[PDB]
Amino acid sequence: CPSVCRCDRNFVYCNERSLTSVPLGIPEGVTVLYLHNNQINNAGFPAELHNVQSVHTVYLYGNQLDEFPMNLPKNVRVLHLQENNIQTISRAALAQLLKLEELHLDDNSISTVGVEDGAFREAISLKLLFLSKNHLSSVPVGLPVDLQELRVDENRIAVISDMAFQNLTSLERLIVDGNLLTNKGIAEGTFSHLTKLKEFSIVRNSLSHPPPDLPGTHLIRLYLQDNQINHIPLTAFANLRKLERLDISNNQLRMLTQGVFDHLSNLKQLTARNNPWFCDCSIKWVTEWLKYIPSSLNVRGFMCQGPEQVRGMAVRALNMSCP
Numbered sequence: 001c002p003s004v005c006r007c008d009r010n011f012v013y014c015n016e017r018s019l020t021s022v023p024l025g026i027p028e029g030v031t032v033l034y035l036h037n038n039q040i041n042n043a044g045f046p047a048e049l050h051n052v053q054s055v056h057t058v059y060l061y062g063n064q065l066d067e068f069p070m071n072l073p074k075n076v077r078v079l080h081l082q083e084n085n086i087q088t089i090s091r092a093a094l095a096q097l098l099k100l101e102e103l104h105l106d107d108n109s110i111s112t113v114g115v116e117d118g119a120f121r122e123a124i125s126l127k128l129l130f131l132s133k134n135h136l137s138s139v140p141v142g143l144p145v146d147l148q149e150l151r152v153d154e155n156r157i158a159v160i161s162d163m164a165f166q167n168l169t170s171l172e173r174l175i176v177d178g179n180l181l182t183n184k185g186i187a188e189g190t191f192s193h194l195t196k197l198k199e200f201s202i203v204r205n206s207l208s209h210p211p212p213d214l215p216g217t218h219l220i221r222l223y224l225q226d227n228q229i230n231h232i233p234l235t236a237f238a239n240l241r242k243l244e245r246l247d248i249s250n251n252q253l254r255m256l257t258q259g260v261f262d263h264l265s266n267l268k269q270l271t272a273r274n275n276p277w278f279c280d281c282s283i284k285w286v287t288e289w290l291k292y293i294p295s296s297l298n299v300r301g302f303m304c305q306g307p308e309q310v311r312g313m314a315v316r317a318l319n320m321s322c323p
Helices: 091-096 281-292
Strands: 006-008 011-013 032-034 057-059 078-080 102-104 128-130 149-151 173-175 199-201 221-223 245-247 269-271 298-300 304-306
Touching: none
Parallel strands: 011 032, 032 057, 057 078, 078 102, 102 128, 128 149, 149 173, 173 199, 199 221, 221 245, 245 269, 269 298
Antiparallel strands: 006 011
């Protein structure tokens, strides 16, 4: 055990000690390693730290790191690297942590150029990757096959390549919300091969319509909130039969095309709040759909914003003005 750093019940507590580098005196049989809330630099990691095989959980949050740390313990499953100033992600560093299952790179200055081509792909055991609040311009191409959750929210992402989600059949959750993403930015059939995907979130983005060619093999939740969606195509919600929760709130939708929720048989909840719904003969089907829909479906937000004669009233309570 180190001189300044304390150890209790096979847990190393180096946290809140203002350490410039990771200490040398790390015992052979330690469970969890705490090195958070310090001033540890990128060149403060000894080669002997990688030799320790007993450690599976390492905390390194709120440090002075600039790159992804090297010589980290070989058999680490959960790794926390949030609140620091990481900019560069190296292919060699992630090749060391072969048993890495969970990774947190939140609140950092990570860019597309900083991430080396196929750096994350090296981490073969990677199931959970949290790239929240970074300066990333696009989704990296070299991603792990065994990935189950990709949270790349609150970034500067505008484009998504067709090769970015290559071989990722095991991915269940994809959170790409709070980005500069557009429908032209996303490649044709980029999400199509995500068979095991259960949840999809793209809130606070600039999409003119929902993403085309989405798989409904295991998709349950679809979030299209706070977007610039003006229209929804007839084939968009089609082939998504297993969907339960849907959200189209806070968009620029004027009306909905007849037979859009026709294929959604397992639907349970729908939200369309803060949308400029123009109540005319275009929403006649919406009124009839809401009248015959079972109580199992929770539909909210269908209110008239125009014209003034219909304004304020709910679409479900309407009667028509036209044939």
